[PDB]
Structures are given as C-alpha cells and as structure tokens.
Design a protein around this motif. Structure first.
Motif, PDB file in Angstrom:
ATOM      1  N   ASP A  25      38.876  41.059  30.526  1.00  0.00           N
ATOM      2  CA  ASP A  25      38.243  40.161  31.152  1.00  0.00           C
ATOM      3  C   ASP A  25      37.472  40.742  32.372  1.00  0.00           C
ATOM      4  O   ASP A  25      37.649  40.336  33.345  1.00  0.00           O
ATOM      5  CB  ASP A  25      39.317  38.946  31.500  1.00  0.00           C
ATOM      6  N   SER A  27      35.256  40.208  33.912  1.00  0.00           N
ATOM      7  CA  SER A  27      34.414  39.067  34.659  1.00  0.00           C
ATOM      8  C   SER A  27      34.168  39.285  35.927  1.00  0.00           C
ATOM      9  O   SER A  27      35.090  40.085  36.856  1.00  0.00           O
ATOM     10  CB  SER A  27      34.870  37.761  34.210  1.00  0.00           C
ATOM     11  N   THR A  29      33.728  37.699  39.880  1.00  0.00           N
ATOM     12  CA  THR A  29      33.999  36.555  40.491  1.00  0.00           C
ATOM     13  C   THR A  29      34.641  37.047  42.079  1.00  0.00           C
ATOM     14  O   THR A  29      35.463  37.668  41.935  1.00  0.00           O
ATOM     15  CB  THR A  29      34.993  35.655  39.919  1.00  0.00           C
ATOM     16  N   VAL A  57      35.385  43.373  38.936  1.00  0.00           N
ATOM     17  CA  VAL A  57      34.411  43.757  37.627  1.00  0.00           C
ATOM     18  C   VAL A  57      34.677  45.192  37.225  1.00  0.00           C
ATOM     19  O   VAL A  57      34.729  46.151  37.962  1.00  0.00           O
ATOM     20  CB  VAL A  57      33.015  43.524  37.906  1.00  0.00           C
TER      21      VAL A  57
END
Length: 86
Positions: A25, A27, A29, A57
């Motif tokens: 993941d 991702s 954020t 990330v």
C-alpha cells in the motif's frame, strides 16, 4: 519494517529515512497522531513537539518538524519501537 539508516541532509530538522518498507500500500497521505492500533513508528513521533505532518510513500518517508526539534532525542524514542520487534 525497520529503519535501515538516516540520511543527514544539510538541513536543520528535515531528514530522509531510507528503509525497505512494503509496497503493498505505497499510498501517499499526511498523518500524525498517537492512537491505539496505529503504527508505533508514527505514534512515538507524535509524543514529541515539532512534528506537524508525516508523509508515507514508496520505500522512503519524509518527516517535517519545526526548527525546535532534535532527532538526538527521537533516536532513543523510536529505537525502542524497533528494538522491541527486532
């Protein structure tokens, strides 16, 4: 999973932490807050005044902290988290 090393850039309180983290993941954020059930590698950081946001990330992370922050105090703080699991 575990901090490999720390890149000391010609900055004041900004540094890059290189480590082999899972790409499951990857991702992006920005979050910051100590809470149960949440990664200790992030909660421990919130226990120190200075951090305003943390970006996660890829296989690297960037931590933003005020000029009044010193990693010299976090080392023993975070190392405890890894030391335990490790």
């Amino acid at each position: 999973m575990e901090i490999i090393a720390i890149s000391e850039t010609p900055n004041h309180n900004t540094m890059k932490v290189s480590l082999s983290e899972p790409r499951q993941d990857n991702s992006f954020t920005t979050y910051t807050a100590a809470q149960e059930g949440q990664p200790e590698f992030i909660n421990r950081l919130f226990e120190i005044e200075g951090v305003k946001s943390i970006f996660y990330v890829l296989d690297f992370i960037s931590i933003d902290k005020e000029d009044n922050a010193n990693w010299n105090e976090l080392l023993p703080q975070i190392e405890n988290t890894f030391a335990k699991s490790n």
